[PDB]
Tab-separated table of C-alpha atoms in Angstrom:
chain	number	residue	atom	x	y	z
S	238	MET	CA	70.433	109.503	144.334
S	239	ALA	CA	73.884	107.886	144.592
S	240	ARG	CA	75.797	106.465	141.606
S	241	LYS	CA	79.007	104.463	141.697
S	242	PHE	CA	81.928	106.490	140.314
S	243	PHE	CA	83.043	105.059	136.952
S	244	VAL	CA	86.457	105.304	135.295
S	245	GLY	CA	87.019	103.806	131.854
S	246	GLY	CA	90.353	103.746	130.130
S	247	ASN	CA	90.131	103.729	126.339
S	248	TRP	CA	93.512	102.656	124.933
S	249	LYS	CA	92.384	103.425	121.349
S	250	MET	CA	94.862	102.147	118.756
S	251	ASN	CA	97.751	101.706	121.149
S	252	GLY	CA	99.612	98.742	122.583
S	253	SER	CA	102.088	95.921	122.126
S	254	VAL	CA	102.538	92.666	124.036
S	255	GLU	CA	105.503	94.263	125.800
S	256	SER	CA	103.803	97.598	126.515
S	257	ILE	CA	100.610	95.924	127.675
S	258	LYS	CA	102.607	93.601	129.947
S	259	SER	CA	104.135	96.608	131.728
S	260	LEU	CA	100.835	98.511	131.784
S	261	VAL	CA	98.881	95.577	133.258
S	262	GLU	CA	101.641	94.938	135.791
S	263	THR	CA	101.414	98.563	136.918
S	264	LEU	CA	97.627	98.242	137.342
S	265	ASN	CA	97.998	94.918	139.193
S	266	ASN	CA	100.536	96.488	141.580
S	267	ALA	CA	98.392	99.585	142.157
S	268	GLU	CA	96.252	100.454	145.173
S	269	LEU	CA	92.831	101.356	143.808
S	270	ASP	CA	89.939	103.140	145.447
S	271	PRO	CA	87.435	100.335	146.210
S	272	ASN	CA	84.546	102.682	145.544
S	273	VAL	CA	85.388	103.075	141.818
S	274	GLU	CA	84.139	100.861	138.971
S	275	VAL	CA	87.039	100.542	136.495
S	276	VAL	CA	86.910	99.364	132.863
S	277	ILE	CA	89.720	99.280	130.331
S	278	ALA	CA	89.360	98.874	126.550
S	279	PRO	CA	92.347	97.308	124.718
S	280	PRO	CA	92.553	96.932	120.943
S	281	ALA	CA	90.504	93.935	119.861
S	282	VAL	CA	93.556	91.742	119.139
S	283	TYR	CA	94.818	92.111	122.710
S	284	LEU	CA	91.529	91.412	124.508
S	285	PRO	CA	92.425	87.755	125.354
S	286	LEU	CA	95.877	88.757	126.608
S	287	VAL	CA	94.513	91.561	128.794
S	288	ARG	CA	91.587	89.541	130.072
S	289	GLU	CA	93.919	86.764	131.251
S	290	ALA	CA	96.588	88.978	132.837
S	291	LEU	CA	94.518	91.822	134.335
S	292	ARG	CA	93.252	91.972	137.919
S	293	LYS	CA	89.664	90.735	137.931
S	294	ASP	CA	88.278	93.809	139.686
S	295	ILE	CA	88.947	95.804	136.494
S	296	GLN	CA	86.708	94.564	133.720
S	297	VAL	CA	87.593	94.627	130.058
S	298	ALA	CA	85.738	96.400	127.238
S	299	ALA	CA	85.942	96.119	123.515
S	300	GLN	CA	86.322	99.383	121.651
S	301	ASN	CA	83.498	98.588	119.188
S	302	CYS	CA	81.230	95.811	117.937
S	303	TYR	CA	78.677	95.200	115.156
S	304	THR	CA	74.897	94.722	115.084
S	305	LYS	CA	74.498	90.974	114.401
S	306	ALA	CA	75.606	87.729	116.003
S	307	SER	CA	77.526	86.705	112.850
S	308	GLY	CA	77.738	86.948	109.089
S	309	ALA	CA	79.432	88.509	106.076
S	310	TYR	CA	81.009	91.635	107.641
S	311	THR	CA	84.730	91.326	106.985
S	312	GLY	CA	86.632	93.119	109.711
S	313	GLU	CA	83.766	93.274	112.224
S	314	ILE	CA	83.430	91.796	115.721
S	315	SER	CA	80.158	90.515	117.166
S	316	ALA	CA	78.841	91.071	120.669
S	317	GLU	CA	78.479	87.276	120.863
S	318	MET	CA	82.208	86.890	120.275
S	319	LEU	CA	82.805	89.313	123.159
S	320	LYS	CA	80.559	87.257	125.450
S	321	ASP	CA	82.337	84.080	124.286
S	322	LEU	CA	85.654	85.576	125.403
S	323	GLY	CA	84.345	86.890	128.741
S	324	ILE	CA	84.333	90.580	127.761
S	325	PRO	CA	81.449	92.258	129.629
S	326	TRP	CA	81.714	95.810	128.188
S	327	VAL	CA	81.790	97.582	124.838
S	328	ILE	CA	82.333	101.226	123.900
S	329	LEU	CA	79.852	102.313	121.257
S	330	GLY	CA	79.511	105.554	119.341
S	331	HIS	CA	82.965	106.948	120.199
S	332	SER	CA	83.515	110.264	118.426
S	333	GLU	CA	86.292	108.796	116.282
S	334	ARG	CA	83.923	106.107	115.033
S	335	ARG	CA	81.119	108.600	114.454
S	336	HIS	CA	83.264	111.266	112.742
S	337	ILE	CA	86.188	109.481	111.083
S	338	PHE	CA	84.408	106.223	110.227
S	339	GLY	CA	80.935	107.690	109.652
S	340	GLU	CA	78.922	105.659	112.159
S	341	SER	CA	75.440	107.180	112.159
S	342	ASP	CA	73.207	107.752	115.205
S	343	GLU	CA	70.956	104.892	114.143
S	344	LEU	CA	73.843	102.486	113.558
S	345	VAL	CA	75.117	103.349	117.029
S	346	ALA	CA	71.645	102.696	118.421
S	347	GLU	CA	71.444	99.364	116.535
S	348	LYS	CA	74.765	98.284	117.997
S	349	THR	CA	73.683	99.412	121.473
S	350	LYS	CA	70.380	97.513	121.432
S	351	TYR	CA	72.160	94.428	120.061
S	352	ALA	CA	74.965	94.544	122.654
S	353	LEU	CA	72.500	94.972	125.535
S	354	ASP	CA	70.334	92.101	124.258
S	355	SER	CA	73.555	90.010	124.255
S	356	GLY	CA	74.097	90.762	127.949
S	357	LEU	CA	76.920	93.280	127.564
S	358	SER	CA	77.119	96.644	129.266
S	359	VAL	CA	77.631	99.666	127.041
S	360	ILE	CA	79.617	102.848	127.367
S	361	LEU	CA	77.545	104.989	125.038
S	362	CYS	CA	79.510	107.996	123.764
S	363	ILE	CA	77.821	111.215	122.628
S	364	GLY	CA	78.873	114.801	122.086
S	365	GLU	CA	79.035	117.706	119.684
S	366	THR	CA	81.760	119.076	117.404
S	367	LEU	CA	83.141	122.631	117.388
S	368	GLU	CA	81.067	123.417	114.324
S	369	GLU	CA	77.880	122.151	115.970
S	370	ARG	CA	78.574	124.179	119.175
S	371	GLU	CA	79.282	127.333	117.139
S	372	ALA	CA	75.944	126.716	115.359
S	373	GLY	CA	74.151	126.511	118.694
S	374	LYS	CA	73.377	122.810	118.223
S	375	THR	CA	74.802	121.417	121.529
S	376	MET	CA	71.409	120.474	122.937
S	377	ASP	CA	69.966	119.364	119.596
S	378	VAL	CA	72.914	117.057	118.863
S	379	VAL	CA	73.006	115.308	122.250
S	380	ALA	CA	69.205	114.994	122.235
S	381	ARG	CA	69.277	113.395	118.769
S	382	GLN	CA	72.098	111.013	119.623
S	383	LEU	CA	70.382	109.899	122.873
S	384	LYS	CA	66.937	109.695	121.268
S	385	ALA	CA	68.165	107.124	118.761
S	386	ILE	CA	69.114	104.838	121.692
S	387	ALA	CA	66.029	105.673	123.770
S	388	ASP	CA	63.731	104.749	120.876
S	389	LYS	CA	65.456	101.368	120.657
S	390	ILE	CA	65.963	100.254	124.270
S	391	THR	CA	63.751	99.629	127.295
S	392	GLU	CA	63.793	101.587	130.533
S	393	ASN	CA	65.434	98.590	132.201
S	394	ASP	CA	68.057	98.426	129.434
S	395	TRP	CA	69.476	101.736	130.687
S	396	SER	CA	70.642	99.930	133.839
S	397	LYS	CA	73.639	98.633	131.898
S	398	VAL	CA	74.378	101.860	129.974
S	399	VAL	CA	76.974	104.425	131.010
S	400	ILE	CA	76.848	107.678	129.032
S	401	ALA	CA	80.177	109.297	128.148
S	402	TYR	CA	79.938	112.951	127.134
S	403	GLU	CA	82.799	113.749	124.729
S	404	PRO	CA	83.239	117.504	124.125
S	405	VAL	CA	84.521	116.905	120.597
S	406	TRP	CA	84.583	120.719	120.224
S	407	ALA	CA	87.409	120.785	122.779
S	408	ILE	CA	89.373	117.796	121.457
S	409	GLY	CA	92.230	118.783	119.177
S	410	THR	CA	90.847	122.282	118.766
S	411	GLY	CA	92.003	125.548	120.240
S	412	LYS	CA	89.273	125.426	122.847
S	413	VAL	CA	89.473	123.886	126.332
S	414	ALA	CA	86.549	122.789	128.447
S	415	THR	CA	86.105	123.917	132.012
S	416	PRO	CA	84.575	121.739	134.703
S	417	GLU	CA	81.701	124.205	134.619
S	418	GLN	CA	81.226	123.697	130.874
S	419	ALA	CA	81.323	119.926	131.346
S	420	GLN	CA	78.911	120.118	134.277
S	421	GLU	CA	76.468	122.208	132.188
S	422	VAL	CA	76.191	119.504	129.478
S	423	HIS	CA	75.968	116.633	131.975
S	424	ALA	CA	73.058	118.373	133.677
S	425	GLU	CA	71.417	118.835	130.260
S	426	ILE	CA	71.844	115.126	129.481
S	427	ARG	CA	70.389	114.108	132.828
S	428	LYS	CA	67.407	116.415	132.329
S	429	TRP	CA	66.880	114.902	128.873
S	430	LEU	CA	66.825	111.421	130.417
S	431	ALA	CA	64.381	112.566	133.079
S	432	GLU	CA	62.058	114.090	130.494
S	433	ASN	CA	62.408	111.418	127.786
S	434	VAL	CA	63.042	108.151	129.633
S	435	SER	CA	62.130	108.415	133.337
S	436	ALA	CA	63.142	110.110	136.564
S	437	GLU	CA	64.650	106.851	137.830
S	438	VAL	CA	66.912	106.371	134.793
S	439	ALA	CA	68.089	109.980	135.104
S	440	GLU	CA	68.958	109.513	138.774
S	441	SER	CA	70.779	106.180	138.354
S	442	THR	CA	72.579	106.529	134.994
S	443	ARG	CA	76.265	107.385	135.322
S	444	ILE	CA	77.256	110.249	133.029
S	445	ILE	CA	81.046	110.249	132.633
S	446	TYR	CA	83.210	112.996	131.157
S	447	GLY	CA	85.153	112.061	128.051
S	448	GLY	CA	87.186	115.181	127.380
S	449	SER	CA	90.892	115.537	128.061
S	450	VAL	CA	91.303	113.929	131.483
S	451	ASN	CA	94.728	113.611	133.084
S	452	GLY	CA	96.262	113.490	136.558
S	453	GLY	CA	96.334	117.290	136.751
S	454	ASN	CA	92.632	118.003	136.127
S	455	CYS	CA	90.724	114.913	137.288
S	456	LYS	CA	90.311	116.051	140.914
S	457	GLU	CA	88.538	119.272	139.861
S	458	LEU	CA	86.232	117.560	137.340
S	459	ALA	CA	85.125	114.896	139.801
S	460	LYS	CA	83.816	117.590	142.184
S	461	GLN	CA	81.046	118.530	139.708
S	462	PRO	CA	77.722	117.005	140.821
S	463	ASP	CA	76.688	115.541	137.444
S	464	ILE	CA	80.094	114.146	136.420
S	465	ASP	CA	80.032	110.478	137.497
S	466	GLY	CA	83.517	109.629	136.317
S	467	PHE	CA	85.665	109.673	133.239
S	468	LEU	CA	86.371	108.072	129.909
S	469	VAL	CA	90.122	108.556	129.755
S	470	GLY	CA	92.090	108.646	126.492
S	471	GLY	CA	95.849	109.044	126.367
S	472	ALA	CA	96.275	109.110	130.147
S	473	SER	CA	94.908	105.545	130.324
S	474	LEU	CA	98.215	104.401	128.821
S	475	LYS	CA	100.253	106.024	131.633
S	476	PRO	CA	100.794	105.316	135.358
S	477	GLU	CA	98.643	108.347	136.173
S	478	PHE	CA	95.561	106.345	135.149
S	479	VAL	CA	95.828	105.051	138.723
S	480	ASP	CA	95.714	108.617	140.029
S	481	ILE	CA	92.601	109.269	137.919
S	482	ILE	CA	90.857	106.186	139.351
S	483	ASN	CA	91.748	107.584	142.809
S	484	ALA	CA	90.574	111.124	141.996
S	485	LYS	CA	88.185	111.097	145.006
S	486	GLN	CA	90.336	109.489	147.762
E	40	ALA	CA	105.390	79.418	88.065
E	41	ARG	CA	103.129	81.357	90.452
E	42	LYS	CA	102.469	79.437	93.661
E	43	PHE	CA	98.745	78.609	94.010
E	44	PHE	CA	97.167	80.584	96.867
E	45	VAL	CA	94.070	79.766	98.919
E	46	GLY	CA	92.799	82.185	101.548
E	47	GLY	CA	89.857	81.485	103.828
E	48	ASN	CA	87.998	84.551	105.016
E	49	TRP	CA	85.860	83.675	108.065
E	50	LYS	CA	84.411	87.197	108.165
E	51	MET	CA	82.336	87.795	111.309
E	52	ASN	CA	82.007	84.115	112.223
E	53	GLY	CA	83.491	81.996	114.967
E	54	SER	CA	83.511	81.007	118.635
E	55	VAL	CA	86.263	79.402	120.704
E	56	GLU	CA	84.481	76.075	120.262
E	57	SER	CA	83.543	76.363	116.578
E	58	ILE	CA	87.049	77.626	115.815
E	59	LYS	CA	88.647	74.779	117.787
E	60	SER	CA	86.748	72.293	115.624
E	61	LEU	CA	87.678	74.111	112.389
E	62	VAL	CA	91.382	74.225	113.310
E	63	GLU	CA	91.476	70.557	114.330
E	64	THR	CA	90.043	69.591	110.931
E	65	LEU	CA	92.750	71.641	109.168
E	66	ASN	CA	95.450	70.231	111.460
E	67	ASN	CA	94.410	66.682	110.490
E	68	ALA	CA	93.925	67.343	106.778
E	69	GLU	CA	96.176	66.078	104.028
E	70	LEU	CA	97.005	69.279	102.146
E	71	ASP	CA	98.557	69.890	98.753
E	72	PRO	CA	102.079	70.954	99.765
E	73	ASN	CA	102.438	73.301	96.786
E	74	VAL	CA	99.568	75.538	97.994
E	75	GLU	CA	100.090	78.635	100.139
E	76	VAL	CA	97.132	78.696	102.565
E	77	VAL	CA	96.077	81.656	104.711
E	78	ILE	CA	93.201	81.878	107.236
E	79	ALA	CA	91.601	85.177	108.369
E	80	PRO	CA	89.799	84.838	111.762
E	81	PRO	CA	87.914	87.712	113.411
E	82	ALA	CA	90.468	89.924	115.161
E	83	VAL	CA	89.682	88.783	118.719
E	84	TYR	CA	90.638	85.209	117.753
E	85	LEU	CA	93.934	85.892	115.963
E	86	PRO	CA	96.061	84.827	118.992
E	87	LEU	CA	93.954	81.692	119.452
E	88	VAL	CA	94.240	80.604	115.820
E	89	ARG	CA	97.920	81.572	115.612
E	90	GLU	CA	98.708	79.337	118.625
E	91	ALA	CA	96.630	76.320	117.607
E	92	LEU	CA	96.991	76.097	113.832
E	93	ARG	CA	99.581	74.054	111.940
E	94	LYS	CA	102.489	76.338	111.078
E	95	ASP	CA	102.292	75.706	107.318
E	96	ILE	CA	99.051	77.734	107.248
E	97	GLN	CA	99.604	81.468	107.839
E	98	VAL	CA	97.101	83.730	109.588
E	99	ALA	CA	95.632	86.979	108.251
E	100	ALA	CA	93.710	89.823	109.793
E	101	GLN	CA	90.515	90.944	108.023
E	102	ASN	CA	91.414	94.676	108.134
E	103	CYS	CA	93.841	97.217	109.610
E	104	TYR	CA	94.422	101.031	109.689
E	105	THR	CA	97.086	103.286	108.137
E	106	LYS	CA	99.328	104.274	111.036
E	107	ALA	CA	101.289	102.590	113.818
E	108	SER	CA	99.230	104.025	116.667
E	109	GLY	CA	97.041	106.865	117.901
E	110	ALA	CA	93.481	108.051	118.512
E	111	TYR	CA	91.492	105.646	116.326
E	112	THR	CA	89.063	103.870	118.645
E	113	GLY	CA	88.206	100.455	117.233
E	114	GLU	CA	91.083	100.194	114.744
E	115	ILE	CA	93.985	97.740	114.578
E	116	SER	CA	97.378	98.727	113.235
E	117	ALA	CA	99.649	96.581	111.080
E	118	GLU	CA	102.321	97.014	113.738
E	119	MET	CA	100.044	95.178	116.219
E	120	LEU	CA	99.613	92.396	113.664
E	121	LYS	CA	103.396	92.115	113.264
E	122	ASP	CA	103.704	92.145	117.050
E	123	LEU	CA	101.379	89.148	117.293
E	124	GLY	CA	103.066	87.215	114.501
E	125	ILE	CA	100.278	87.822	111.961
E	126	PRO	CA	101.971	87.942	108.515
E	127	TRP	CA	98.929	88.764	106.299
E	128	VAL	CA	96.080	91.284	106.072
E	129	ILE	CA	93.032	91.460	103.794
E	130	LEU	CA	92.512	94.997	102.552
E	131	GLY	CA	89.829	96.543	100.387
E	132	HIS	CA	87.338	93.718	100.802
E	133	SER	CA	84.127	94.565	98.976
E	134	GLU	CA	82.205	94.599	102.269
E	135	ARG	CA	84.525	97.251	103.705
E	136	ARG	CA	84.442	99.309	100.477
E	137	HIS	CA	80.627	99.208	100.236
E	138	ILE	CA	79.118	98.739	103.697
E	139	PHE	CA	81.774	100.795	105.472
E	140	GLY	CA	82.535	103.286	102.689
E	141	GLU	CA	86.317	102.718	102.500
E	142	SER	CA	87.669	104.828	99.634
E	143	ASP	CA	90.199	103.742	96.993
E	144	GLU	CA	92.772	106.072	98.552
E	145	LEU	CA	92.146	104.712	102.043
E	146	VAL	CA	92.624	101.149	100.793
E	147	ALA	CA	95.812	102.281	99.036
E	148	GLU	CA	97.058	103.998	102.214
E	149	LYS	CA	96.345	100.910	104.295
E	150	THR	CA	98.101	98.764	101.701
E	151	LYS	CA	101.214	100.955	101.678
E	152	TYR	CA	101.331	101.073	105.471
E	153	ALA	CA	100.856	97.290	105.879
E	154	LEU	CA	103.609	96.503	103.371
E	155	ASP	CA	105.963	99.002	105.056
E	156	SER	CA	105.233	97.310	108.404
E	157	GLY	CA	106.393	93.999	106.921
E	158	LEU	CA	103.024	92.340	106.234
E	159	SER	CA	101.782	90.662	103.096
E	160	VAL	CA	98.490	91.960	101.718
E	161	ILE	CA	95.539	90.299	100.038
E	162	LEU	CA	94.232	93.278	98.062
E	163	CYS	CA	90.606	92.969	97.037
E	164	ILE	CA	89.138	94.646	93.974
E	165	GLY	CA	86.070	94.150	91.818
E	166	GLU	CA	83.014	95.743	90.238
E	167	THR	CA	79.316	95.794	91.139
E	168	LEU	CA	76.416	94.480	89.057
E	169	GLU	CA	75.530	98.005	87.892
E	170	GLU	CA	79.112	98.760	86.907
E	171	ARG	CA	79.412	95.464	85.029
E	172	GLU	CA	76.130	95.954	83.129
E	173	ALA	CA	77.329	99.450	82.165
E	174	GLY	CA	80.501	97.853	80.797
E	175	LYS	CA	82.943	99.417	83.293
E	176	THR	CA	84.492	96.221	84.718
E	177	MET	CA	87.981	97.206	83.593
E	178	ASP	CA	87.473	100.884	84.349
E	179	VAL	CA	86.609	99.997	87.964
E	180	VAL	CA	89.336	97.411	88.540
E	181	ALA	CA	91.925	99.583	86.799
E	182	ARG	CA	90.903	102.508	88.996
E	183	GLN	CA	91.019	100.413	92.166
E	184	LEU	CA	94.422	99.043	91.180
E	185	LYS	CA	95.808	102.397	90.086
E	186	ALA	CA	95.239	103.838	93.546
E	187	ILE	CA	97.560	101.156	94.991
E	188	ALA	CA	100.098	101.424	92.156
E	189	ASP	CA	100.341	105.185	92.780
E	190	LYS	CA	101.324	104.568	96.408
E	191	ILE	CA	103.606	101.500	96.527
E	192	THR	CA	106.883	100.697	94.803
E	193	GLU	CA	107.431	98.062	92.146
E	194	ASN	CA	109.217	95.949	94.741
E	195	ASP	CA	106.300	96.390	97.156
E	196	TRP	CA	104.099	94.299	94.820
E	197	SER	CA	106.242	91.279	95.722
E	198	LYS	CA	104.178	90.754	98.860
E	199	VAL	CA	100.805	91.548	97.309
E	200	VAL	CA	98.172	89.051	96.222
E	201	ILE	CA	95.210	90.474	94.293
E	202	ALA	CA	91.802	88.971	94.983
E	203	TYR	CA	89.288	89.655	92.232
E	204	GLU	CA	85.840	89.765	93.845
E	205	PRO	CA	83.030	89.769	91.272
E	206	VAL	CA	80.821	91.903	93.484
E	207	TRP	CA	78.360	91.670	90.585
E	208	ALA	CA	78.156	87.932	91.386
E	209	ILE	CA	78.213	88.168	95.209
E	210	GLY	CA	74.736	88.606	96.662
E	211	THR	CA	73.234	89.309	93.250
E	212	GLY	CA	71.926	85.844	92.387
E	213	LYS	CA	74.321	85.646	89.481
E	214	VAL	CA	77.104	83.127	89.253
E	215	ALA	CA	80.350	83.669	87.434
E	216	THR	CA	81.622	81.136	85.022
E	217	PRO	CA	85.274	80.145	84.837
E	218	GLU	CA	85.429	81.900	81.476
E	219	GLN	CA	84.124	85.157	82.946
E	220	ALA	CA	86.588	84.911	85.818
E	221	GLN	CA	89.512	84.066	83.546
E	222	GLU	CA	88.660	86.997	81.260
E	223	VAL	CA	88.880	89.504	84.188
E	224	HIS	CA	92.005	87.868	85.630
E	225	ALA	CA	93.745	88.075	82.265
E	226	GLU	CA	92.798	91.775	82.025
E	227	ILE	CA	94.176	92.379	85.540
E	228	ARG	CA	97.500	90.750	84.711
E	229	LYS	CA	97.771	92.715	81.485
E	230	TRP	CA	96.985	95.866	83.480
E	231	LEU	CA	99.896	95.007	85.771
E	232	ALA	CA	102.189	94.367	82.800
E	233	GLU	CA	101.399	97.683	81.167
E	234	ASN	CA	101.169	99.892	84.286
E	235	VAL	CA	103.648	98.353	86.758
E	236	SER	CA	106.224	96.016	85.157
E	237	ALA	CA	106.650	92.712	83.342
E	238	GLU	CA	107.939	91.053	86.523
E	239	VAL	CA	105.013	92.178	88.700
E	240	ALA	CA	102.578	90.896	86.071
E	241	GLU	CA	104.196	87.433	85.933
E	242	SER	CA	104.807	87.131	89.710
E	243	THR	CA	101.604	88.514	91.243
E	244	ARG	CA	99.038	85.886	92.255
E	245	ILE	CA	95.553	86.880	91.145
E	246	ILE	CA	93.076	84.799	93.138
E	247	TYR	CA	89.365	84.470	92.521
E	248	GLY	CA	87.112	85.739	95.303
E	249	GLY	CA	83.626	85.009	94.049
E	250	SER	CA	81.475	82.122	95.387
E	251	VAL	CA	83.964	79.221	95.554
E	252	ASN	CA	82.975	75.769	96.781
E	253	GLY	CA	83.990	72.123	96.464
E	254	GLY	CA	81.790	71.698	93.413
E	255	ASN	CA	83.324	74.510	91.341
E	256	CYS	CA	86.894	74.918	92.619
E	257	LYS	CA	88.558	72.452	90.213
E	258	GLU	CA	87.306	74.030	86.978
E	259	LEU	CA	88.173	77.527	88.230
E	260	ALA	CA	91.704	76.427	89.143
E	261	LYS	CA	92.324	75.176	85.573
E	262	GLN	CA	92.053	78.706	84.229
E	263	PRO	CA	95.560	79.936	83.386
E	264	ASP	CA	95.288	83.335	85.092
E	265	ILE	CA	93.436	82.140	88.217
E	266	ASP	CA	96.141	81.515	90.845
E	267	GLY	CA	93.880	80.381	93.687
E	268	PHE	CA	90.920	81.546	95.747
E	269	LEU	CA	89.682	83.885	98.470
E	270	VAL	CA	86.978	81.644	99.943
E	271	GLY	CA	84.048	82.953	101.988
E	272	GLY	CA	81.449	80.735	103.601
E	273	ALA	CA	82.997	77.471	102.444
E	274	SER	CA	86.087	78.372	104.480
E	275	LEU	CA	83.932	77.608	107.562
E	276	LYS	CA	83.181	74.067	106.283
E	277	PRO	CA	85.163	70.822	105.793
E	278	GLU	CA	85.142	71.328	102.008
E	279	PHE	CA	87.707	74.094	102.497
E	280	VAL	CA	90.202	71.224	102.418
E	281	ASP	CA	88.984	70.197	98.921
E	282	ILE	CA	89.339	73.802	97.745
E	283	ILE	CA	92.929	73.928	99.004
E	284	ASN	CA	93.457	70.724	96.984
E	285	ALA	CA	91.738	72.074	93.862
E	286	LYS	CA	94.880	71.478	91.798
E	287	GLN	CA	95.177	67.811	92.811
E	288	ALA	CA	93.564	65.000	90.805
C-alpha cells in the first residue's frame, strides 16, 4: 500500500560546467527530506561531471538511451555505457522525444525492455496531447503507450519502473491542469496496471506527475492519493527544486 | 593545398576500458604530421577522451541540436560542446538521416547553429542504392548540399568538411571503387564552385565516408578530389593509424 515518494529533476537541454557546479553545490548544501527518492538527469555530456560531484543519495539518470549494447547508431548512447559510467537511471519516452523526435510506442518499449535487462531503472513517460484529449483519446492513448511496455516486460520488471504522467495537453498550451485532473489520470493508470499487469504492480508502482511543477504548486499536487511524486522540468534548474523534494515535510 | 583530413566515427561503441586502450594506441602512434585527425566518441565519453587524448587529435561529437538550450530532452547543444572544449561535430550522418528521420532542413539548421557557436562541422551527405540506380546521385547530393548553402554564409564554409557517404555502398553489399568515389567527389567540388564560390570549392575538404580500411585507404587517398576519410568500424581498430597515414609511403 505504501510507495516511496519520488522526485526526478529533468534538466533537458540545459547546463554548463559553471552552471552545473553552482547547481550541484546548492543540492549538496541542501537539507533534503530523507523519505524522498531523488533522481536528476543531466545532458549526456555532463553525466560524468555530475556523477562525480553530486551527493550520492541523489542518483543520476540519463535523458535517453538506445535499444542495443553497441553498433552503428551515430549519436546514440547505450544502456551498457550508462552502466559502465555508474548511471543507474534512464528517462524513456519523454514527450519531447515522442513528439519532436518521433519515438514510437514500440521503440520506447524496446528501449525500456533493453534498459531493464541491463540493470537500469526506468522513468517511463506517457501522456496525451491536447488534440488527443479533445478527441476523447486520453484513456486510449495511455493504455496503448503502457501496453507496449507491458507486452515486453515481466511482472517483476515493473519493480524498477517509475511511470511519469505528462499532461502534454497542458504543456505550452492555453490549458492548465488541476491536481484533480492529474489525480484522475493517475487513478486511471493505476487501474490499467491492476487490470493488465497485476494488483501488486498497481499497488507498488510509483506514478509521478510530469506537468508544470514548481515551488508554488507542488504541495497541493503531492496531497493527491495517486500522485507519488514529480518529474520536474524547468524548476529542476532552480533552488526551488529543493522545496519540491521537501513538498511533504 | 587542402590539408588531408581523417575522422574516426566510433558511433555507439566504447567503454571506459576499451576507450582507454584505443586512446593509448593513438597516443603512442607515429602519425603523419600533415594530417588533421578528429575522433568522435559517444557523447558520455567526450570529457574522458578530451582529457586523455594527445592534443594534436581533436574531438568531435556525433550529433547536436539547433539551439543553445531549452526543452529538448535527450539533445546536446553546440554551446555545451564549446563549453567542454569539443571543437567538431558530425552532422547529417546517414544513420541520423535514415534511422532517425532527420530532414535536410534540420541538418542545415544544426549546421548553421554549430558554426555560429564556433564549432567546425563534418557535414555528411550521400545517396541510397535506390537513388543511385535511378541515376539521382547528383540530384540527391546537390539537394542535401543546397539546404546547407541556403542557410550559411560563404565564409561559414571555411569550417566545414563534407563527408561523402555512399549510402548505396554502406550495408548494401556493394563496394565503391576509387573511381566511383572520385567521380562523386569531383561533382561535389564542381557543385561548390558553381553554387557557392571558387574559394569554397578549392578550400573545402571532401572526405570519403564509405567502407575505409587499411587495405583500401592508400588507393582512395591518391584520388585528386578525395581529401581524407570518415572512418567507421576501422576507427575502433589499430589499423586506424594506417588510415591516418594513408598518404605516407
